[PDB]
C-alpha cells in the first residue's frame, strides 16, 4: 500500500488519553518511537493528573498496531498501515472477568511526521476492592496473540484477544478484548485474510522520573499465513 | 515554564507584515491557528497591497516558533513559550546566495487570546532578474533543521539554518538565516542547551480567494536532546 | 464595508453615562482607545457624581462592539463597523436573576476622530441588600460569548448572552442580556449570519486616582463561522 | 550458556543488507527461520532496489552462525549463541582471487523474538567482465568447512575458510574469507577451542516471485572436537 | 535404491524423545553415528529432564534400522534406506507381559547430513512396583531377531519381535513389539520378502557424565534369505 | 586363547579392498562365511568400480588366516585367533617375478558378529603386457604351504610363501609373499613355534552375477608340529 | 571308482560327536589320520564337556569304514570310498543286551583334504548300575567281523555285527549293531556282493593328556570274496 512507505524508518509517537473509570478522571501523555521494520515500540507514559487510579498494565492495550512487523509475504494483509496517513478509528470494549469494563475510542493518524494516538476511555461497574480498583495487578505483562479478521460491512477489521493479567496472589485476571478498526479516509484499504499479531511487552520505571508513569517496550509481529514455500524447501532437501 | 500553559489548546494567530524590498512596498495580513501539542500551524496570508513583489516562499520563515512541539523530556529548553505572554523579539538577516538580503524585526506576543506576530521587513540589493525579483522560485517548500543555542549575553537565543528554495530550472537558491530572539518582558526565561527544530511545510492556494495569497500548513518538532533512557530500553530487551 | 476603514488604526473613545438605579442618580465619564485590528479596548471610567451606587462590574457591558476583531473570513458579518460613522443605537434590558433590571439606550457614533458611546440607564426593582445594591460582587470579570443574529425587520441585529458575576460568598449572580442594535443612518449595513463574539475583560484600579473609578482592559474576537478551508488543510496533510 | 536457551525452538529471522560494489548500490531484505537444534536455515532474499548487480551466490556467506548445531559435547565452544541476546559484530574481508574484494560489517542480535542480521557491504576493485561483475557464476553452492579459533585479545573469535564458486566454463572462483566476531554486550561469552562448522547449502527460486531473489536452505553442524568416548566404545566391543 | 547411497559412509545421528509413562513426563536427547557398511551404531542418550522415570533398557528399541548391514544379495529388501532421504514413520506398541505398554510414533529422516529420529512415547497401565516403574531391570541387553514382512496395503513393512529384559532376581520380563513402518515421501520404496535383522547391543556409562544417561553400542545385520550359491560351493568342493 | 572361542561356529565375513595398481584405481567388496572348525572359507568378491584391472587370482591371498583349522595339539600356536576380537594388522609385499609388486596393509578384526578384513593395496612397476596387466593368468589356483614363524620383536609373526600362478601358455608366474602380522590390541597373543598352513583354493563364477567377480572356496589347515604320540601308536601295534 | 583315488595316501581325519545318553549330554572331538592302503587308523578322542558319562569302548564303533583295506580283487565292492567325496550317511541302532540302546546318525564326507565324521548319538533306557552307566567295561577291545550286504532299495548297504565288550567280572556284554549307509551325492556308487571287514582295535591313554580321552589304533581289512585263483595255484604246484 502507499501508507506502508510512511513506516520504513523510525517514526515519533505521541499518545494522549482522557480517562474516566468509576468517576475517577485522569489523563495520560505518552511519547516515544516506533520502528515497524522490527515491530518495535519504545514508549514512556505519564499520568499528568497525579496518581493513576487504575493499574498501569490495564491500559497497555489502549495505549499502535500500525507498527506491527508484517512479513513480506503478508504485506497485502496490513490494514493498519494501508489506512495511513489519514488514519483509523480503533474502538474497543474490554471486559474484565468478574469486574468492570473499559470502553475506548481512539483515532490513530499522522500529524506531520508524528504518529498520534488520541484516546477516550470510559470505565464502569468496577468493584471497589477488585483487582483493578484495589491495585492487585503485578507490574508485568504477558505475551498474546491478537486475532484479526476482515469486517467488510464496515470496510475495516474486527480484532479479538484475551489479555492475562497476573495478580499478586498468583491468580490471573482475564481481560476479554473486542475491537473494531475503521478507516478515517475514503481511500482504499487492505482487508486482510485471517491472521494474528504475536505480541510481547516489557514494563519498567524510569529512575529519574518522579511522576506516576510507565515505560513500555513492545515487539509485535504478524503471523498465521503461510509463505507457501514448504514444498520448495522439501524439494531443496531432496537435492 | 508558566508560559507553556498558554499553548495547551488551539490558539488563534494573527500575523502582520510591512515590507520594502528594493523600494517595492507591500503589506501582508495572515490568520489561522496553532496547536503546539502537535506542533501544527494552519495559516492563510493575504497581500493587502495587491501583487506581492517577491515570491511567497521567500517569506515563509518570516511569517511562530512558540508553536513547536517540545518533547516532554525537552520542556526546559523551550525559550519561546517561556517568554510568553509578554513575548519576544525575533530579528533576522536572511542572505540569499548571489543575491540580496532581507532584514527582519518581529515582536511575537499575546494580545488577549490571540498570538500576534508583527513584522517589519527590509530587502536590499536584489538583482532585477534574479530568482527573487524575477519570480523563479517554485511554489513549494523543503524540510529543514533549525539550530538553536543559548545567547546568555542577551538573555535569549541564537538560531541558524539554511533554507533551500527550489528554482524552476532545477537549481536551488540558498537563503542563509541568522536569527536572534530576546525576551520583551523582564520575567525569567529558559535558556536552552543546544537543540534543533525539525520543520516541514506545505503550501497551497485557496480556490475561493481572488487576492494574492498563500495557504500554509506547517509542523515543527523539537529534537536533538536524548531522553536518556537508551540503557533502560536495552535492559528491558535483555528481559 | 466603508465603515470598516475607520477602525484600521487606534481610535480614541469617549463614554458618557447618565444612570438612575432605584432613584440613585449618577453619572460616569470614560476615556481610552480601541484597536479593532487586535480587538483591544483600554478604558478608564470615573463616577463624576461621587460614589457609584452599584458595583462597577454590573456596568461593564453597558460601557463598544465596533472594536471587535472580525476575522478576514467574517468581514461581511460586522454590522457594527458597517453602521459607521453615522452609528447605531444599542438598547438592552439586563435581567439580574432574583433581583432588578437595567434598561439601557446608547448611541455609538463618531464625533470627528473620536468614537463616542452616549448612554442612558434606568434600573428598577433592585433589592436593598441584594448583590447589586448590597455591593456583594467581586471586583473581577468572566469571559463570555455574545451571540449575534440578524434582525431584518429592524435592519439591525439582535444579541443575547448571560453574564456571570462572581459574588463574595462564592455564588454567581446571573445577568441575562437582551440587546438590539439598529443603524442611525440610512446607508446600507451588513446583516450578519449567526455568529458570536468571544470576550475577556480585566478590571483594575489606577493607584493615582482618588475618584471612584474602574480601569478596564478588554479583548473581543468574532467567531463561530468556518473559514471553509478544513478540507484544503487535510489535502495538504496527505501531501 | 544462557544465550543457548534462546535457540531451542524455531526462531524467525530478518536479514537486511545495504551494498555498494564498484559504485553499484543495492539493498536486500531476507526473511525466514532457523532451527539450531537441527542446524537448519530456511530463507528467502529479495533485492529491493531492482536487479542485483553481483551474482546471488557471492552474497550467501554475508547473508547466521548462531544457528549452527553444536553437538552436546561441544556446547562450551558455541561463542555465537553465548553472545545472545545482545549479539555480536561479524566483520569480514572476502578476497576474490584475481578480482575484487568485499568488506562487510554485520550486527547479529535479537529484536524481541526475531533474530536480525543487519549488514553493510562495500565491494571494490572488481573487473568489469570478471566472474562477479560479468555474472559468470553458476547458481549453486558447495559445502565447506568454516574454521574457528578463539581471539582472546578481542574477547571473540577469528574465523577462516575458502569458498569455491563454480563458474559456467567449469573453472572455480575462490573467495578467501577472513572473519572476526566480537560481542556487543559486556556479559561473559564462550571462547572456544579450535573447531569448525561443516556447511551445505541449496539455492533455488520461488516460481511465484517476480522480484530478483534467492531461496536458500542451509544446514550447519559444528565438528572437530572429540566426544572422548572412543576407548569406551572399544571396551564395549570387547564385551 | 537411491537412498542406499546416503549410508555408504559414517552418518551423524540425532535422536529426540518426548515421553509420558503413567503421567511421568521426560525428554531424552541422543547423539552419535551410524556406519551401515558394518551395521554399527554408537550413541549416547541424555535425560534432559532429570532422572529417567523408567529403566534405560526399556527404551533401547525406541531410540535406527536404516543402519542395518544388508548383505549384497539382500540389497533389494532394504525398505529402510529405500525410504530415504524423505524418511519413514515407525509406529509401535510394546506390550510388557503382566504390566503396561508403550505406544510410540517416530519419524526417521535426514536433516541435511544428519539422520534424525524424532519420537513421541506414551506409556500406560504400568504397575507401581512392577519391573518397569520399580526399576528392577538389569543394566544390560540381549541379542534378538527382528522379523520383517512386507505390508503392501500401507506401502511399507510390518515388524515383530520379543525383547527379553533380564530382571535382578533372575527372571525375564518380555516386551512384545508390534511395529509398522511407512514411507513419508511418495517416491518408490522396496517392499521386502520375509527376512530378519540380527541385533546385539552393549550398554554402558560415560564416567565423565553426571546427567542420567545411557551409552549404547549396537550391531545390526540383515539375514534370512539365501545367497543361492549353496550348489555352486558344493560343485566347487567336488573339484 | 580367549579369542579361539569366537570361531567355534560359522562366522560372517566382510572384505573391503581399495586398490591402485600402476594408477588403475579399483575397489572390491566381498562377503561370505568362515568355519574354522573345518578350515573352510566360502566367499564371493565383487569389483564395485567396474572391470578389475588385474587378474582375480593375483588378489586371492590379499582377500583370513584366523579361519585356519588348527589341530587340537597345535592350539597354542594360533596367533591369529589369539589376537581376536581386537584383531591384527596383516602387511605384505608380494613380488611378482620379472614384474611388479603389490604392497598391502590390512586390519582383520570383529565388528560385532562379523569378521572384517579391510585392505589397502598399492601395485607399482607392472609391465603393460606382462602376465598381470596383460591378463595372462588362468582362472584357477594351486595349493601352497604358508610358513609361519614368531616375530618376538614385534609381538607378532612373520610369514613367507611363494604362490604359483598358472599362465595361459603353460608357464608359471611366481609371486613371492613376505608377510608380517601384529596385534591391534594390547592383550596377550600366542607366539607360535615354527609351523605352516596347508591351503587349497577353488575359483568359480556365479552364473547369476553380471558384475566382475570371483567366487572362492578355500580350505586351510595348520600342520608341521608333531602330536608326539608316534611312539605310543608303535607300542599299541606291538600289542 | 573315482572316490578310491582320494584314499591312496595318508588322509587327515576329524570326528565330532554330540551325545545324549539317559539325559547325560556330552561332546567328543577326535583327530588323527587314516591310511587305507594298510587299513590303518590312528586317532585320539577328547571329551570336550568333562567326564564321559559312558565307557569309552561303547563309542568305538560310532567314532570310518572308508579307510578299510580292500584287496585288489575286491575293489568293485567298496561302497564307502565310491561315495566320496560327497560322502555317506551312516545310521545305526546298537542294542546292548539286557540294557539300553544307542541310535546314531553320522555323515562321513571330505571337507577339503580332511575326512570328517560328524555324529549325533541318542542313548535311552540304560540301567543306572548296568555295565554302561555303572562303568563296568574293561578298557580294551576285541576283533570282529563286520558283515556287509547291498541294499539296492536305498542305493546303499546294510551292515550287521555283534560287538563283544569284556566286563570287569569276566562276563561279556554284547552290543548288537544294525547299520545302514546311504550316499549323500547323486553320483554312481558301488553296490557290493556279500563280504565282511575284519577289524582289530587297540585302546590306550596319552600320558601327557589330562582331559578324559581315548587313543585308538585300528586295522580294518575287507575279506570274504575269493580271488578265484585257487585252481591256478594248484596247477602251478603240479609243475
Amino acid at each position: 500500500s502507499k501508507g506502508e512507505e510512511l513506516f520504513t524508518g523510525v517514526v515519533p509517537i505521541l499518545v494522549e488519553l482522557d480517562g474516566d473509570v468509576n468517576g475517577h478522571k485522569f489523563s495520560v501523555s505518552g511519547e516515544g518511537e516506533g520502528d515497524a521494520t522490527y515491530g518495535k515500540l519504545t514508549l514512556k507514559f505519564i499520568c499528568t493528573t497525579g496518581k493513576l487510579p487504575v493499574p498501569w498494565p490495564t491500559l497497555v492495550t489502549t495505549f499502535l498496531q500500525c507498527f506491527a512487523r508484517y512479513p513480506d509475504h503478508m504485506k497485502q494483509h496490513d490494514f493498519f498501515k494501508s489506512a495511513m496517513p489519514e488514519g483509523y478509528v480503533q474502538e474497543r470494549t474490554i471486559f474484565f472477568k468478574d469486574d468492570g469494563n473499559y470502553k475506548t475510542r481512539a483515532e490513530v493518524k499522522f500529524e506531520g511526521d508524528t504518529l498520534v494516538n488520541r484516546i477516550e476511555l470510559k470505565g464502569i461497574d468496577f468493584k471497589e476492592d477488585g483487582n483493578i480498583l484495589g491495585h492487585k495487578l503485578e507490574y508485568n505483562y504477558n505475551s498474546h496473540n491478537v486475532y484479526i479478521m476482515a469486517d467488510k460491512q464496515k470496510n475495516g477489521i474486527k480484532v479479538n484477544f484475551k489479555i492475562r493479567h497476573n495478580i499478586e496472589d498468583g491468580s490471573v485476571q482475564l481481560a476479554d478484548h473486542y475491537q473494531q478498526n475503521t478507516p478515517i479516509g475514503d481511500g482504499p484499504v487492505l482487508l486482510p485474510d485471517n491472521h494474528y499479531l504475536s505480541t510481547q511487552s516489557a514494563l519498567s520505571k524510569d529512575p529519574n522520573e518522579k511522576r506516576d508513569h510507565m515505560v513500555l517496550l513492545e515487539f509485535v509481529t504478524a503471523a498465521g499465513i503461510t509463505h507457501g514455500m514448504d514444498e520448495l524447501y522439501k524439494a531443496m532437501a531432496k537435492e
Side-chain angles (χ1 to χ4, degrees), chain A residues 27-45:
Chain A
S27 290
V28 172
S29 299
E31 296 185 17
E33 63 191 27
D35 196 351
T37 297
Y38 312 100
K40 181 177 188 175
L41 293 168
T42 51
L43 295 153
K44 178 174 162 192
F45 299 91

Side-chain angles (χ1 to χ4, degrees), chain A residues 90-131:
Chain A
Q90 180 160 299
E91 292 173 294
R92 296 206 178 97
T93 304
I94 304 169
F95 300 91
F96 293 90
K97 185 179 173 54
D98 297 320
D99 211 333
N101 64 84
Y102 292 168
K103 293 193 177 64
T104 68
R105 183 178 185 286
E107 298 195 351
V108 184
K109 69 168 88 184
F110 276 93
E111 291 291 351
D113 286 339
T114 299
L115 190 283
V116 178
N117 181 14
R118 278 176 278 222
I119 312 140
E120 300 207 319
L121 177 152
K122 189 64 149 45
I124 66 180
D125 300 334
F126 283 87
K127 294 174 180 169
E128 272 177 29
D129 199 47
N131 291 324

